[PDB]
């Protein structure tokens, strides 16, 4: 454990590197669901 | 630190497992925002 504790210790300090808010999104984009009934009745 | 260094060393080797580009997306899908004005004026 000279070889073991020493060894065990990180075998042969994890440092998370993280990432990013992958979700971009844009749904809103005046979803056609507004002017689809403009003048349903002409 | 026989118990301490040995101990300290990873107490009792972090290996990140990562994930995936969760964002699937499809927005484009000919967003109705193209043929919503086909013949607004009949």
mmCIF file with all atom_site columns, C-alpha atoms in Angstrom:
data_model
loop_
_atom_site.group_PDB
_atom_site.id
_atom_site.type_symbol
_atom_site.label_atom_id
_atom_site.label_alt_id
_atom_site.label_comp_id
_atom_site.label_asym_id
_atom_site.label_entity_id
_atom_site.label_seq_id
_atom_site.pdbx_PDB_ins_code
_atom_site.Cartn_x
_atom_site.Cartn_y
_atom_site.Cartn_z
_atom_site.occupancy
_atom_site.B_iso_or_equiv
_atom_site.pdbx_formal_charge
_atom_site.auth_seq_id
_atom_site.auth_comp_id
_atom_site.auth_asym_id
_atom_site.auth_atom_id
_atom_site.pdbx_PDB_model_num
ATOM 1  C CA . UNK A 1 1  ? 0.000   0.000  0.000   1.00 0.00 ? 1  UNK A CA 1
ATOM 2  C CA . UNK A 1 2  ? 3.500   1.842  -0.145  1.00 0.00 ? 2  UNK A CA 1
ATOM 3  C CA . UNK A 1 3  ? 2.548   0.297  -3.216  1.00 0.00 ? 3  UNK A CA 1
ATOM 4  C CA . UNK A 1 4  ? -1.411  -0.156 -1.666  1.00 0.00 ? 4  UNK A CA 1
ATOM 5  C CA . UNK A 1 5  ? -2.314  3.520  0.209   1.00 0.00 ? 5  UNK A CA 1
ATOM 6  C CA . UNK A 1 6  ? -0.069  5.297  -2.357  1.00 0.00 ? 6  UNK A CA 1
ATOM 7  C CA . UNK A 1 7  ? -1.491  3.036  -5.117  1.00 0.00 ? 7  UNK A CA 1
ATOM 8  C CA . UNK A 1 8  ? -5.145  3.124  -3.911  1.00 0.00 ? 8  UNK A CA 1
ATOM 9  C CA . UNK A 1 9  ? -4.827  6.955  -3.852  1.00 0.00 ? 9  UNK A CA 1
ATOM 10 C CA . UNK A 1 10 ? -6.092  7.643  -7.417  1.00 0.00 ? 10 UNK A CA 1
ATOM 11 C CA . UNK A 1 11 ? -4.765  4.153  -8.368  1.00 0.00 ? 11 UNK A CA 1
ATOM 12 C CA . UNK A 1 12 ? -2.159  4.986  -11.066 1.00 0.00 ? 12 UNK A CA 1
ATOM 13 C CA . UNK A 1 13 ? -8.266  13.990 -8.056  1.00 0.00 ? 13 UNK A CA 1
ATOM 14 C CA . UNK A 1 14 ? -11.291 13.872 -10.450 1.00 0.00 ? 14 UNK A CA 1
ATOM 15 C CA . UNK A 1 15 ? -11.846 17.389 -11.915 1.00 0.00 ? 15 UNK A CA 1
ATOM 16 C CA . UNK A 1 16 ? -15.337 17.839 -13.452 1.00 0.00 ? 16 UNK A CA 1
ATOM 17 C CA . UNK A 1 17 ? -15.131 19.880 -16.717 1.00 0.00 ? 17 UNK A CA 1
ATOM 18 C CA . UNK A 1 18 ? -18.922 20.545 -16.932 1.00 0.00 ? 18 UNK A CA 1
ATOM 19 C CA . UNK A 1 19 ? -20.553 21.481 -20.282 1.00 0.00 ? 19 UNK A CA 1
ATOM 20 C CA . UNK A 1 20 ? -23.265 24.001 -21.316 1.00 0.00 ? 20 UNK A CA 1
ATOM 21 C CA . UNK A 1 21 ? -27.071 24.579 -21.389 1.00 0.00 ? 21 UNK A CA 1
ATOM 22 C CA . UNK A 1 22 ? -27.288 22.414 -24.558 1.00 0.00 ? 22 UNK A CA 1
ATOM 23 C CA . UNK A 1 23 ? -30.991 23.417 -24.849 1.00 0.00 ? 23 UNK A CA 1
ATOM 24 C CA . UNK A 1 24 ? -31.013 26.311 -27.393 1.00 0.00 ? 24 UNK A CA 1
ATOM 25 C CA . UNK A 1 25 ? -34.806 26.430 -28.126 1.00 0.00 ? 25 UNK A CA 1
ATOM 26 C CA . UNK A 1 26 ? -36.895 29.033 -30.067 1.00 0.00 ? 26 UNK A CA 1
ATOM 27 C CA . UNK A 1 27 ? -40.394 27.409 -29.970 1.00 0.00 ? 27 UNK A CA 1
ATOM 28 C CA . UNK A 1 28 ? -42.090 30.809 -29.349 1.00 0.00 ? 28 UNK A CA 1
ATOM 29 C CA . UNK A 1 29 ? -41.205 32.101 -32.877 1.00 0.00 ? 29 UNK A CA 1
ATOM 30 C CA . UNK A 1 30 ? -44.789 33.496 -33.175 1.00 0.00 ? 30 UNK A CA 1
ATOM 31 C CA . UNK A 1 31 ? -45.825 29.788 -33.415 1.00 0.00 ? 31 UNK A CA 1
ATOM 32 C CA . UNK A 1 32 ? -48.229 29.790 -36.434 1.00 0.00 ? 32 UNK A CA 1
ATOM 33 C CA . UNK A 1 33 ? -50.863 28.978 -33.730 1.00 0.00 ? 33 UNK A CA 1
ATOM 34 C CA . UNK A 1 34 ? -51.916 32.840 -33.776 1.00 0.00 ? 34 UNK A CA 1
ATOM 35 C CA . UNK A 1 35 ? -52.673 33.957 -37.384 1.00 0.00 ? 35 UNK A CA 1
ATOM 36 C CA . UNK A 1 36 ? -54.075 30.507 -38.370 1.00 0.00 ? 36 UNK A CA 1
ATOM 37 C CA . UNK A 1 37 ? -57.603 31.830 -37.561 1.00 0.00 ? 37 UNK A CA 1
ATOM 38 C CA . UNK A 1 38 ? -57.043 35.375 -38.994 1.00 0.00 ? 38 UNK A CA 1
ATOM 39 C CA . UNK A 1 39 ? -60.326 35.291 -41.022 1.00 0.00 ? 39 UNK A CA 1
ATOM 40 C CA . UNK A 1 40 ? -61.451 31.622 -40.793 1.00 0.00 ? 40 UNK A CA 1
ATOM 41 C CA . UNK A 1 41 ? -64.868 33.121 -41.693 1.00 0.00 ? 41 UNK A CA 1
ATOM 42 C CA . UNK A 1 42 ? -64.259 35.237 -44.843 1.00 0.00 ? 42 UNK A CA 1
ATOM 43 C CA . UNK B 2 1  ? -1.618  9.522  6.971   1.00 0.00 ? 1  UNK B CA 1
ATOM 44 C CA . UNK B 2 2  ? -0.274  5.811  6.665   1.00 0.00 ? 2  UNK B CA 1
ATOM 45 C CA . UNK B 2 3  ? -3.703  6.037  7.623   1.00 0.00 ? 3  UNK B CA 1
ATOM 46 C CA . UNK B 2 4  ? -3.660  10.164 6.511   1.00 0.00 ? 4  UNK B CA 1
ATOM 47 C CA . UNK B 2 5  ? -1.594  10.316 2.830   1.00 0.00 ? 5  UNK B CA 1
ATOM 48 C CA . UNK B 2 6  ? -2.924  6.800  2.021   1.00 0.00 ? 6  UNK B CA 1
ATOM 49 C CA . UNK B 2 7  ? -6.343  7.800  3.458   1.00 0.00 ? 7  UNK B CA 1
ATOM 50 C CA . UNK B 2 8  ? -6.425  11.345 1.960   1.00 0.00 ? 8  UNK B CA 1
ATOM 51 C CA . UNK B 2 9  ? -5.609  9.719  -1.427  1.00 0.00 ? 9  UNK B CA 1
ATOM 52 C CA . UNK B 2 10 ? -9.220  9.225  -2.655  1.00 0.00 ? 10 UNK B CA 1
ATOM 53 C CA . UNK B 2 11 ? -10.255 8.989  1.049   1.00 0.00 ? 11 UNK B CA 1
ATOM 54 C CA . UNK B 2 12 ? -11.751 5.453  1.247   1.00 0.00 ? 12 UNK B CA 1
ATOM 55 C CA . UNK B 2 13 ? -9.453  8.568  -9.358  1.00 0.00 ? 13 UNK B CA 1
ATOM 56 C CA . UNK B 2 14 ? -12.700 10.307 -10.513 1.00 0.00 ? 14 UNK B CA 1
ATOM 57 C CA . UNK B 2 15 ? -13.643 8.972  -13.998 1.00 0.00 ? 15 UNK B CA 1
ATOM 58 C CA . UNK B 2 16 ? -16.154 11.225 -15.837 1.00 0.00 ? 16 UNK B CA 1
ATOM 59 C CA . UNK B 2 17 ? -18.765 9.099  -17.715 1.00 0.00 ? 17 UNK B CA 1
ATOM 60 C CA . UNK B 2 18 ? -20.112 12.024 -19.834 1.00 0.00 ? 18 UNK B CA 1
ATOM 61 C CA . UNK B 2 19 ? -23.601 11.835 -21.429 1.00 0.00 ? 19 UNK B CA 1
ATOM 62 C CA . UNK B 2 20 ? -25.032 12.864 -24.845 1.00 0.00 ? 20 UNK B CA 1
ATOM 63 C CA . UNK B 2 21 ? -26.267 15.886 -26.887 1.00 0.00 ? 21 UNK B CA 1
ATOM 64 C CA . UNK B 2 22 ? -29.648 15.668 -25.070 1.00 0.00 ? 22 UNK B CA 1
ATOM 65 C CA . UNK B 2 23 ? -30.979 18.368 -27.467 1.00 0.00 ? 23 UNK B CA 1
ATOM 66 C CA . UNK B 2 24 ? -32.852 16.399 -30.199 1.00 0.00 ? 24 UNK B CA 1
ATOM 67 C CA . UNK B 2 25 ? -34.773 19.328 -31.833 1.00 0.00 ? 25 UNK B CA 1
ATOM 68 C CA . UNK B 2 26 ? -36.824 19.458 -35.099 1.00 0.00 ? 26 UNK B CA 1
ATOM 69 C CA . UNK B 2 27 ? -38.174 23.071 -34.995 1.00 0.00 ? 27 UNK B CA 1
ATOM 70 C CA . UNK B 2 28 ? -37.584 23.533 -38.771 1.00 0.00 ? 28 UNK B CA 1
ATOM 71 C CA . UNK B 2 29 ? -40.340 20.997 -39.699 1.00 0.00 ? 29 UNK B CA 1
ATOM 72 C CA . UNK B 2 30 ? -41.571 23.452 -42.408 1.00 0.00 ? 30 UNK B CA 1
ATOM 73 C CA . UNK B 2 31 ? -42.771 25.579 -39.424 1.00 0.00 ? 31 UNK B CA 1
ATOM 74 C CA . UNK B 2 32 ? -46.370 26.511 -40.459 1.00 0.00 ? 32 UNK B CA 1
ATOM 75 C CA . UNK B 2 33 ? -44.876 30.063 -40.688 1.00 0.00 ? 33 UNK B CA 1
ATOM 76 C CA . UNK B 2 34 ? -44.610 29.560 -44.649 1.00 0.00 ? 34 UNK B CA 1
ATOM 77 C CA . UNK B 2 35 ? -48.018 28.462 -46.070 1.00 0.00 ? 35 UNK B CA 1
ATOM 78 C CA . UNK B 2 36 ? -49.988 30.533 -43.487 1.00 0.00 ? 36 UNK B CA 1
ATOM 79 C CA . UNK B 2 37 ? -50.185 33.378 -46.078 1.00 0.00 ? 37 UNK B CA 1
ATOM 80 C CA . UNK B 2 38 ? -50.724 31.092 -49.147 1.00 0.00 ? 38 UNK B CA 1
ATOM 81 C CA . UNK B 2 39 ? -53.710 33.175 -50.426 1.00 0.00 ? 39 UNK B CA 1
ATOM 82 C CA . UNK B 2 40 ? -54.498 35.541 -47.499 1.00 0.00 ? 40 UNK B CA 1
ATOM 83 C CA . UNK B 2 41 ? -56.213 37.591 -50.253 1.00 0.00 ? 41 UNK B CA 1
ATOM 84 C CA . UNK B 2 42 ? -58.571 35.135 -52.037 1.00 0.00 ? 42 UNK B CA 1
#
